[PDB]
Design a binder for this molecule. Structure first.
Ligand SMILES: Cc1cc2nc3c(=O)[nH]c(=O)nc-3n(C[C@H](O)[C@H](O)[C@H](O)COP(=O)(O)OP(=O)(O)OC[C@H]3O[C@@H](n4cnc5c(N)ncnc54)[C@H](O)[C@@H]3O)c2cc1C
Length: 291
């Protein structure tokens, strides 16, 4: 049922870049690009929450061909134009200290020109799939590029064109995105996210943790864990619903604080969060993808 590995590293799909647009507005930190690829000519299909591999050109420091890097799909199964012909990624340029270094695949992607051919593999992953049940509740805890699978979910749920194309999925549950980025300009897809909340105030809640513009009660910069702590009781109450799914995505590091906050909330009703969570993971309702 779920498509997987229609293309593999030994014989990847050669797609063409259609467009490559900036998601970080002026005054933001770093570079994050929305890149859309043409899938026509092959049979690459995918669903929300999956990933694809991109094989960058060139060789590594040892002269070995570069290997694929995985990127979370940022478009629904239908693509951004709802035509079933494309796929999009949300790619941050990796750059860092000394160990000024630019990540190989991410720099290649963020600077890639439309018309360029790209080696694509996948799709892969069954850990971040959205439930078919339209009355499910969906909690989304994302930082930076972790917004990507969340975009696939929220677009499928809330875009007019998606609703028209998906007769079998008219979402009527409640979705809540807690999104941590350093600055307002760094809020990826800000305009569309807020548009979704204005149109579906009863079905979508949007919460930001903006570290350079907000302080937590302890006076430190505001991070996603802080927002989870702030709304821990509410989040725990939603999670107790048999139909609630929680999704965590972004660079590793946020899970510890999220657990600590949810643990304190659950403890109030005599529940051991770490145990409850184990059962949620077994049931396929606690979805994590960090990197
Ligand atoms: C399931 C999954 C989903 C992903 N989704 C996304 C996504 O949606 N968007 C996205 O941008 N990326 C995503 N990634 C990460 C992506 O796959 C690449 O790992 C990332 O883009 C960097 O790859 P690169 O080739 O550009 O860097 P590389 O040239 O491969 O360099 C990576 C290496 O740099 C070193 N390094 C990294 N950070 C530091 C640091 N700060 N200080 C010192 N050394 C460091 C480490 O050795 C690391 O192994 C995802 C990864 C996985 C596994």
């Amino acid at each position: 049922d779920v498509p997987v590995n229609l293309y593999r590293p030994n014989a990847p799909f050669i797609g063409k870049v259609i467009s490559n647009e900036p998601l970080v507005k002026e005054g933001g930190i770093g570079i994050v690009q929305h890149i859309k690829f043409d899938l026509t000519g092959g049979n690459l299909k995918y669903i929300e929450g999956q990933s694809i591999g991109i094989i960058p050109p060139g060789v590594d420091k040892n002269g070995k061909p570069e290997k694929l890097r995985l990127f979370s799909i940022a478009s629904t199964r239908h693509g951004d134009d709802v035509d079933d012909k494309t796929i999009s990624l949300c790619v941050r340029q990796l750059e860092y200290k000394h160990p000024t270094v630019y990540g190989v695949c991410s720099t290649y992607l963020t600077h890639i020109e439309p018309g360029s051919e790209v080696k694509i593999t996948g799709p892969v992953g069954k850990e971040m799939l959205l439930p078919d049940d339209p009355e499910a509740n969906v909690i989304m805890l994302a930082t930076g590029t972790g917004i990507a699978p969340m975009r696939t979910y929220l677009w499928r749920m809330f875009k007019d064109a998606e609703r028209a194309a998906n007769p079998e999925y008219q979402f009527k549950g409640f979705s809540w995105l807690v999104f941590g980025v350093p600055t307002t300009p760094n809020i990826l897809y800000k305009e569309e996210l807020e548009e979704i909340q204005q149109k579906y105030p009863d079905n979508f809640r949007l919460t930001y943790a903006i570290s350079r513009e907000q302080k937590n009660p302890q006076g430190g910069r505001m991070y996603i864990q802080d927002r989870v702590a702030e709304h821990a009781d509410q989040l725990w109450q939603l999670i107790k619903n048999q139909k609630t799914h929680t999704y965590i995505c972004g660079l590793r590091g946020m899970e510890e604080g999220i657990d600590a906050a949810l643990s304190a909330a659950a403890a109030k009703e005599g529940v051991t969060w770490s145990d409850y969570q184990k059962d949620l993971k077994k049931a396929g309702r606690w979805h994590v993808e960090t990197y």
